[PDB]
Amino acid sequence: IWQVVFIAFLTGFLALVTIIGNILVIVAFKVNKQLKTVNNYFLLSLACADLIIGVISMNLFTTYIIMNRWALGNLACDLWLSIDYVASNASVMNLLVISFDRYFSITRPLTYRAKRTTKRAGVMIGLAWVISFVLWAPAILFWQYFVGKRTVPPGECFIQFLSEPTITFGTAIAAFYMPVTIMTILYWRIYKETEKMNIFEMLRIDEGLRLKIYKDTEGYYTIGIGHLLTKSPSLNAAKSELDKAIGRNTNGVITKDEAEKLFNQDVDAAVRGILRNAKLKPVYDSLDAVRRAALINMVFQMGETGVAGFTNSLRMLQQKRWDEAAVNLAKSRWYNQTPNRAKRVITTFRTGTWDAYLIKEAQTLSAILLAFIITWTPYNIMVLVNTFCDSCIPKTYWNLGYWLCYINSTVNPVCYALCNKTFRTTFKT
Numbered sequence: 001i002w003q004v005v006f007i008a009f010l011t012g013f014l015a016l017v018t019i020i021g022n023i024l025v026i027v028a029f030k031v032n033k034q035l036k037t038v039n040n041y042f043l044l045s046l047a048c049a050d051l052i053i054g055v056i057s058m059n060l061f062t063t064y065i066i067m068n069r070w071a072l073g074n075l076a077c078d079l080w081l082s083i084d085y086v087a088s089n090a091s092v093m094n095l096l097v098i099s100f101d102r103y104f105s106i107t108r109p110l111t112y113r114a115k116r117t118t119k120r121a122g123v124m125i126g127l128a129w130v131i132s133f134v135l136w137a138p139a140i141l142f143w144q145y146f147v148g149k150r151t152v153p154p155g156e157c158f159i160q161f162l163s164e165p166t167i168t169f170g171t172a173i174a175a176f177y178m179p180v181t182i183m184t185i186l187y188w189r190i191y192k193e194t195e196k197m198n199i200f201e202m203l204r205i206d207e208g209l210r211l212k213i214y215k216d217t218e219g220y221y222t223i224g225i226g227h228l229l230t231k232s233p234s235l236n237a238a239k240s241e242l243d244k245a246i247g248r249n250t251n252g253v254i255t256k257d258e259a260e261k262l263f264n265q266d267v268d269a270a271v272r273g274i275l276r277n278a279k280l281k282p283v284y285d286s287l288d289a290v291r292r293a294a295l296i297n298m299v300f301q302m303g304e305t306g307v308a309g310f311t312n313s314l315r316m317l318q319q320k321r322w323d324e325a326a327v328n329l330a331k332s333r334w335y336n337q338t339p340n341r342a343k344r345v346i347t348t349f350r351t352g353t354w355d356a357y358l359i360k361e362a363q364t365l366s367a368i369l370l371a372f373i374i375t376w377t378p379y380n381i382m383v384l385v386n387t388f389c390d391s392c393i394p395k396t397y398w399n400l401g402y403w404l405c406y407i408n409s410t411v412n413p414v415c416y417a418l419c420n421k422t423f424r425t426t427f428k429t
């Protein structure tokens with residue numbers, strides 16, 4: 001009992017670390033405009049969940065464990081639980097909101113990336129806490145009054161309707177296993193597709209955007225972002241090819257959605273072209289994200305056949321000789337047709353940076369995700385297990401899993417700072 005008490009305070013240490021880390025997140029974000037963004041906004045929400053959970057749950061938990069008994073009675077037990085599950089819930093749903101956000105950033109450039117603000121983010125988050133609360137709290141508090149009696153004996157506290165290992169299983173899957181799988185899906189997708197954002201802003205600048213058919217600087221009929229319709233001067237040809245392309249009668253006009261989807265089609269085709277080609281591929285392998293994106297610009301413009309006839313240049317681009325590549329490109333007919341765009345692309349080649357386009361080059365999601373899964377799944381697996389054998393799990397293991405579920409909330413700020421040097425230097429001060 002003496003050694004037990006001596007070790008008990010460790011938990012307190014962890015709770016303190018949690019509350020200060022989170023409190024730091026909050027303050028640092030509020031006091032530094034740099035840190036204000038949509039993504040950082042969601043990260044603020046998370047740090048909040050972790051704070052409310054670290055100043056309340058971790059502690060009263062430490063208490064309950066220490067005493068071996070529940071002192072504060074029924075209602076304290078109810079509020080503690082409700083705050084706890086509503087909170088951690090809002091934490092999972094917050095993670096989801098994040099993943100889906102970055103996803104809609106990659107896949108829906110015009111519809112999503114373009115209109116997204118910290119206001120919209122705020123709304124989404126608030127709505128999330130709403131959902132969480134409305135799922136857990138009413139159940140946890142009002143289950144007794146509903147059923148008419150209180151299953152819970154005084155002295156030991158837990159959620160009334162969760163007695164059964166099955167309903168607990170199903171609710172863990174729904175509330176954990178499902179959302180985790182989905183976060184993994186969205187994740188690996190984002191991790192595969194991250195560059196489409198940069199290459200998007202790139203082609204966006206170079207080409208520009210128009211919803212209704214307009215004449216190119218060359219005069220050719222062209223629609224959307226960088227989508228060429230036809231070089232024939234007859235408007236009918238263009239409009240018709242376009243219609244083929246959309247699968248509707250466009251009447252010369254298209255929606256922003258249709259547009260973003262067209263772009264995506266185009267880029268995927270560009271890339272697929274670079275990888276199908278014997279020339280562009282190997283070179284394209286040795287290129288860093290910037291330059292590579294440049295290559296995808298040229299290919300997105302002239303086509304694979306087109307960009308493959310640059311062999312004089314390709315040679316040096318693969319050999320990491322830049323100034324010579326650029327020099328080799330300036331002398332071609334490409335540069336002659338539309339010098340500005342090409343000049344931007346080439347500069348992008350030489351420098352290896354987006355500064356020509358003034359462009360800002362997935363982050364932290366790995367960390368947060370990993371922490372979450374690895375501090376939760378022990379417990380969820382322990383539940384899945386308890387479903388099938390009654391006595392195989394002693395209360396100890398439950399408590400431990402719980403603690404992990406906390407050290408998530410502890411570790412999340414840590415992952416914040418460790419991932420972004422911004423949060424580092426902001427905390428230091």
Ligand SMILES: C[N+]1(C)[C@@H]2C[C@@H](OC(=O)C(O)(c3cccs3)c3cccs3)C[C@H]1[C@@H]1O[C@@H]12
Pocket residue numbers: 084085086088089092168171172173175176376379380383401402403405406
């Ligand atoms: C440590 N917790 C506070 C407790 C145990 C863990 O719980 C979870 O991981 C669960 O999947 C479930 C646990 C038990 C039945 S369903 C969730 C609960 C609430 C939203 S998702 C994590 C959090 C959560 O509040 C519970």
